[PDB]
Amino acid sequence: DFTQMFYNQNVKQFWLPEEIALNGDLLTWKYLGKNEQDTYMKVLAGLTLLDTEQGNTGMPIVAEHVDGHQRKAVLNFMAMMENAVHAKSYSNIFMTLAPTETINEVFEWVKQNKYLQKKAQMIVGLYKAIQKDDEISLFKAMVASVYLESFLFYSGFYYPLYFYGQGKLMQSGEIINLILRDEAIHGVYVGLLAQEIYNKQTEEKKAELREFAIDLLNQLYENELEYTEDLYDQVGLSHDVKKFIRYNANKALMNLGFDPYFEEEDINPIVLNGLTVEPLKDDDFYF
Amino acid sequence: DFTQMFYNQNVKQFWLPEEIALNGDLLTWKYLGKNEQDTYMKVLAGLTLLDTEQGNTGMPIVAEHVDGHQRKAVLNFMAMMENAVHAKSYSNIFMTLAPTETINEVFEWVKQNKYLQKKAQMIVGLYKAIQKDDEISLFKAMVASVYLESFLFYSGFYYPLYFYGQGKLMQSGEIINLILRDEAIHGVYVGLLAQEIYNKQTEEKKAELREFAIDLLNQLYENELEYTEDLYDQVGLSHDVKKFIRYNANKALMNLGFDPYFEEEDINPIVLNGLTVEPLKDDDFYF
Amino acid sequence: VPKWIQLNNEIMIQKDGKFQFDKDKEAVHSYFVDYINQNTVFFHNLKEKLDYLVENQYYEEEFLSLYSFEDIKEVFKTAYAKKFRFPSFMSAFKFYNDYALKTNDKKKILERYEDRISIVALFFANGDTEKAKEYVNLMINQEYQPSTPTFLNAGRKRRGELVSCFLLEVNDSLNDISRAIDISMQLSKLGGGVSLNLSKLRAKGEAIKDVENATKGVVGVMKLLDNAFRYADQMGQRQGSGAAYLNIFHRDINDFLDTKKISADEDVRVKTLSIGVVIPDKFVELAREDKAAYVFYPHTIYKEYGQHMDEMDMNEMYDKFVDNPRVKKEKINPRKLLEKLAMLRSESGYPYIMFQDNVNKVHANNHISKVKFSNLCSEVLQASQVSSYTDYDEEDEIGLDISCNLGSLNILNVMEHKSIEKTVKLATDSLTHVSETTDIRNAPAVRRANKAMKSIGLGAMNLHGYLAQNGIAYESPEARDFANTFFMMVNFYSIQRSAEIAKEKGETFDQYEGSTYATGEYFDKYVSTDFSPKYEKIANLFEGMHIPTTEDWKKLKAFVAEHGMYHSYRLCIAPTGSISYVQSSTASVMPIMERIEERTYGNSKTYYPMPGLASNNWFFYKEAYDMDMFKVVDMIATIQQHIDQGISFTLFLKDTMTTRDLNRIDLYAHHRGIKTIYYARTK
Amino acid sequence: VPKWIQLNNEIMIQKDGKFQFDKDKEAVHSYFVDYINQNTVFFHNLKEKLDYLVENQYYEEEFLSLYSFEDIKEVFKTAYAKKFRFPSFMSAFKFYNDYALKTNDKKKILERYEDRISIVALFFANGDTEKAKEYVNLMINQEYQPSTPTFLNAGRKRRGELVSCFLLEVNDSLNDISRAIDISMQLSKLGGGVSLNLSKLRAKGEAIKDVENATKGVVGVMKLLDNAFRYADQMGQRQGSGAAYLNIFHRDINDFLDTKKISADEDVRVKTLSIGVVIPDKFVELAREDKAAYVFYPHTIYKEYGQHMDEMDMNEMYDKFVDNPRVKKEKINPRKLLEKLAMLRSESGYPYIMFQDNVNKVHANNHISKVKFSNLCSEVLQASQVSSYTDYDEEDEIGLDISCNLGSLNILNVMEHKSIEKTVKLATDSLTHVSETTDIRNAPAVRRANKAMKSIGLGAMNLHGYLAQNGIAYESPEARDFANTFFMMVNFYSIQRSAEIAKEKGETFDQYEGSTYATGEYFDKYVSTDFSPKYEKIANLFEGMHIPTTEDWKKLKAFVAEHGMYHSYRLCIAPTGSISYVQSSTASVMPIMERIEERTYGNSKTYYPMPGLASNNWFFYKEAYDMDMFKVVDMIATIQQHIDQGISFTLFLKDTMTTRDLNRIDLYAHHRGIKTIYYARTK
Ligand SMILES: Nc1ncnc2c1ncn2[C@@H]1O[C@H](COP(=O)(O)OP(=O)(O)OP(=O)(O)O)[C@@H](O)[C@H]1O
Ligand SMILES: Cc1cn([C@H]2C[C@H](O)[C@@H](COP(=O)(O)OP(=O)(O)OP(=O)(O)O)O2)c(=O)[nH]c1=O
Ligand SMILES: Cc1cn([C@H]2C[C@H](O)[C@@H](COP(=O)(O)OP(=O)(O)OP(=O)(O)O)O2)c(=O)[nH]c1=O
Ligand SMILES: [Mg+2]
Ligand SMILES: [Mg+2]
Ligand SMILES: [Mn+2]
């Protein structure tokens, strides 16, 4: 009921890194404090590292196990955007703002970071556990994928959106907004594929899949809170970032056809500003 | 030395079938004989099948086994083109020119056609035989992919080109030329990756790989002859198409770094005729 | 999670292998004591509450000014004296979430059930304190439920119209199409559902001013109307809902039906517009004989004969149209069209089916016009006349649109109180008042028809509930016997009240003299046949209640001939969905879909057992999907013989049923005199 | 492949290194001798042909009856006395495939070029045989070309409206929105382009009847308008065309622009509706200073001040709106908005840009109203007054809706004949006749404004063709000098004709007394500045023609003060799309897009060299994409100082130009006085 519509929306959102000139960001970048520059670098590396997993494994593995030519095509298109567009865009932002040695060090740090690794490996673990012709394992991976697309990225997206809403780092903020817009539709689409599997299950199996999804969400959420304090306490933003995580967790759940888990909260206004045919047989007419 | 330039070429060649309005072909289509329309539908259906498998299976699987994020980005982009752009374009052509029943019948015809099933069996079999960290199985699949890109498509491409060259079906022909332009660069790129693997081997191993490539080509060739006769005898063109596929077989071999195998012949001259954002600065408001 | 919600969820927790039905009373009590009493605004006296509500632009002061405060206090005491208690959590939840008046911030509760009942009764009485007390007793006893628009909006300053169902005739012209779009938007702005008849529009490929192939057909107008309804979606609180009806013999029938195919292109697909089909007996006859049929171009027929195709008798004019060279027609397969309808209903539940000859063989106002289409709920069947909207600065020929204000009898409560006559007459009075006080100043045909025809719809609900609570199977012959007797009595007393109103006001409805009531042909079956219960068990249910006999019907016929009738149409059984929870009743006359209803409100799931459900009546609360649709058709046909308008008839289908089964159900309903089929619901 | 197509295709076959331009005369000769002379319906004499045309519902008999047949015969002989020959195949092909009258079966040619010109002249003269002969000479000489509607439909019974440009003001109400949809459909049905001003509609998220967040914004109305224009497709041969204009300070401006993004969701995309933006000087000032700007919710402003936001001076009211708490506004980046506009214009060529302060600082009728928006072609700039469409049975408050009938002077032929004054006056008379003979029956404001304002649009075409055929570069100072002198003379003689018409009829346009013509403020620059050519080469082109001086302008100013002015608007330079081929002239005052125009008609492709193109003048026929857009802006601003309305100004951009280049071009146009920017065409 939905793949051709998503095909259309995906292809009409096509864009390339070269379209946004990045050099003019240096005119606001130079005015940020060390903590602001540090947080931005770390957030950016976090997003980059997670998105690479999605391009190399997440989207291609789902495309492999999903049946249907049109679904495989949409999924291929999404994988292309991760690898050919998003990955180049993140690299471009980095190369503009930091010298080569600084980029290498930030990636070394974020690669060793406990909270980034915990979530990255949790997601990758579920992708690696998909078994041929087993729709339950596929569903679990789709849940992981939706959580990445619609939830885990947002502790990171917060900061570029926060600057973007203030008139700072506008070129890279425009790029991030385009990336985020792609991840939103990716999350919604994979969510619909997961609901299709979920709806084919018994009531007991459904309850079991719901428990899986909520348990996974809880593990990721508790790690996000730690990840958030680790990055944002130094710039005083953690309280507001936490509200943004919960709001996006609720969107991820709704993508999977589940009820919101967290109470509704208002979001930081600066970030908001950034954002069976059968024939009649001639006797059916007589009674 | 080459991936970056292929990346740039692939992304700059990006297109969608909807860019080309097809209602202009309606009259030249109406005017073709029943035999001509039948061959044309079947030819494009055979192409659709090849692109379906190249997009669903061939390109993603090669992407999985090839090392390097940039090489993977090129291969992922090529995969997207196969199933999200190329395979879909044929349906745009079908939906314009043909009634639903004729469309349904031709897709049923691909399922039961023995030559089309044989060529799919052979090519996809090699894709699915790739073993992780086994460069020889990967080489064999890349040879199969080059043969699909640079040889197998051409029994199909002949007919749209033959019409384009006579000023007939020129909108459909424009789509086909764009597809052909893509496959030419896809065949070169995969050819270069295959040569990388071949060049790592002992002379004895190389001799075996040439045997594999030539045996596979001959087996595919013999099947393609029967396919060509089956499609083109009713329009009187089988001998001409055969010359064309031999011509392109030599190009496939060359893409693999091998000498031409068939002698040169005169191809129908008709078929030969068928072939930013930047910010506003303060000074921009003064003159 | 709220404590009351936890108590309600204990319903499903089986104890001793039995549902804990008593947990719902505890759930409702906890809900009240913990939320409703807390969030209910406090007023020292009724005088202060009334002053606060009037001054703060909550109530209309005009209707309250017709009573001395002593009378208002007496009415409110009458409402409160009953000490009404909601029997289930869902009833109180629905009332206090949908109909209970809340502060402008939707934070506190300003109205209780008694307050709303008293305000509605005072609005109905129009300055009569004794009449207001009678209305309060009727509503608090829950014998009568005013439709959701009337119940919610009566006596409120910031209210929509009390009438929520409108039917619009569209003439074949650009002026008429634009006026139809404007009227639909105006009526949806008021919250009412709008049904449009598109049978007079010429088919795709017809000439516009002697230029051929210029017309877009009914599908272009359908896209216009769908966008108009989407735009005027009631400020976003309720998406604009409209229905389009096309005669099956219209050439655009296949394109019209294809707008509801899932595979339909977004350009042709209509998303928010319901579609119904009007099937004359001629189409069913053609399909039965497997003969090749023809669909006609309406404008060619209009030019050849000077009348619209849907204004003519198809059963007589079909052969003439087929034999006329100046009439353009397209060959079709009638059985293929029937099967397409069945498959489309299976996939999406559309289109609605209106059996035109079933509607008009008993239609009392054929002199005014034949019934050509139905409403968005498929229970409104009245004569309409198309308006002629001309160019600016010219005079418009205003016709007759359709609108009726609805009310539902609570069958269980009416039978328990043995008050069929009193309840029916009071409901008729309230519906007449609602019609009289209604004035739409942007739908000239609707306003004119409301003033001229004085049409009301008196429905019924809790038929399955009442039968199950009395140990009667919905599909049993005893249930049909009870429905026959009860609805015969309802029709008798509604006709008597209409005649009494006509005598009191000394005025009938426009063109009454030509109606079957005036000539007496309406009462033929009532004066010649008896409708008293044929089963002793059913006859006992009516003990203490006088069942009108043939002599009573003859006396009523004479009375109507002497005084006439005030209402052109009186009875129509609308779906009555939202207010069924408040009334604690089964929706309309349909069988229950599920014994216990599982709903999600926020993140909390609520459990609603069927009203009166228990261990001893579990078997009688049979779900609709498990019933024989032929028996449901028999029940609806038994009821429909006493309803002057239609009955909103939903078909409940199992997923195993083929399109042939749906077609057989449709053909049996047409055979059994069914007028409209509302929805094809599949399980 | 027809012989004429073969000859025409020989144009591109270079012989001796040069194009065979002489093949076009052979191509047109063969085209005529082998197709047109064969397929021309034969009549023995003019009397028989005219009788056949009138009898068969081809020609209206109302205008023909005003002349004795001797007069009609004399006019037709005058048309044929010139022995007019089409100089190129494309001109004759265009005429005989678009404008030549063909039988109802479209197989034969009833009208030649001379017959069409004679019919148009007889229609214009309104009974004056000498006036008709003057019109015949004017059109056969191709000095004046009536617009496509007037030229094609004049004297035809089946003819549509002779006016094709309509501007509608939409008031902020459901009644007004419905009336706007109806009027748009009615005017599209007539084949005219309809432009709507959406700046008065309240933004998305505004309250309807003290109900907050209920309004859908201008995008829902835009969806309604898009569907209405799609439905009224004018038989589908020419899809319904509508334009929506929104002020840049409107809240919905970002959503208004997002409707044209390719990435936009289909439920928001508006396929058939062109969009223009109205940019006051305040926005440009805010972007220049990089200051944060605000977009306002129009209804809050209307409630606070009792007047619409677009009815106020933003340069005076922006600070008050920002400082007023009761006014709702949200912050935006003016430079980001300008960049978004440039990006959207590069991607799709939209929106049209109207510089409101550039338009209104020279507007002569600011007392009637300021120019708030433009038309579908972006050159109509007139005062409009919104209408108040009330409920049914309530009287409507009809305002002023803009419309003008178009005509184009052929600059090359007007200069060759040295007949600027006579051609301008005859064109003004013909435009006045067309305006007086127009009566729109479903657009009350359009008809009232046509009666009151008597606005006409007299454009010009072949500026680039004339300049190239005279050894003058389009971007050169001499080209601007000639344009200045020529359009100053055109304005002088059109004002003189308007004043003479006012004197002869004794009436001026409504509210003329408050105009700048009446007070003399219009003539300040003409009485203070001399507009004679400053180059000897340009001054020689005007030899034999009297160039008005400051004394002549003083005399004209005194004459206008004495007698007034008949037309509120006289001059507007429309694109003149397809009628330029018939005149063998370049389109409007824009530079040519291509030296040789390659087009495919049927299955054969045709080549159209620019008129007068040859080896000697090949270099002077520089293509627009190769031109400096700053010099094009300079030329258009030079012309615009003598045009009271706007000029359709297309921007021709190379693919290598960034969004900054487009933004700089727009900023330079605003700096140079450019009123509107039509399209961003990229090579
Ligand atoms: N280029 C053209 N434009 C318009 N009409 C043309 C053209 N060429 C030919 N005709 C029409 O076709 C007729 C025959 O053309 P042709 O050149 O053969 O005429 P002719 O006998 O030489 O003399 P004349 O030019 O006086 O007609 C012309 O009289 C004119 O009616
Ligand atoms: C104007 C117009 C009408 N129609 C359809 C809708 C109407 O039901 C039908 C008649 O339009 P009308 O408004 O009645 O046009 P008309 O009265 O001038 O022409 P006629 O004398 O033939 O009646 O044409 C379109 O489909 N598209 C259009 O653009
Ligand atoms: C009725 C309606 C109006 N509107 C918009 C269109 C109009 O420009 C705007 C005003 O509607 P109006 O028709 O003017 O509503 P109103 O005058 O009764 O209420 P108010 O005086 O507060 O304005 O609201 C919607 O978006 N949706 C709707 O359903
Ligand atoms: Mg009509
Ligand atoms: Mg209003
Ligand atoms: Mn990504």
Ligand SMILES: [Mn+2]
């Ligand atoms: Mn993604």
Ligand SMILES: [Mn+2]
């Ligand atoms: Mn391909």
Ligand SMILES: [Mn+2]
């Ligand atoms: Mn390929």
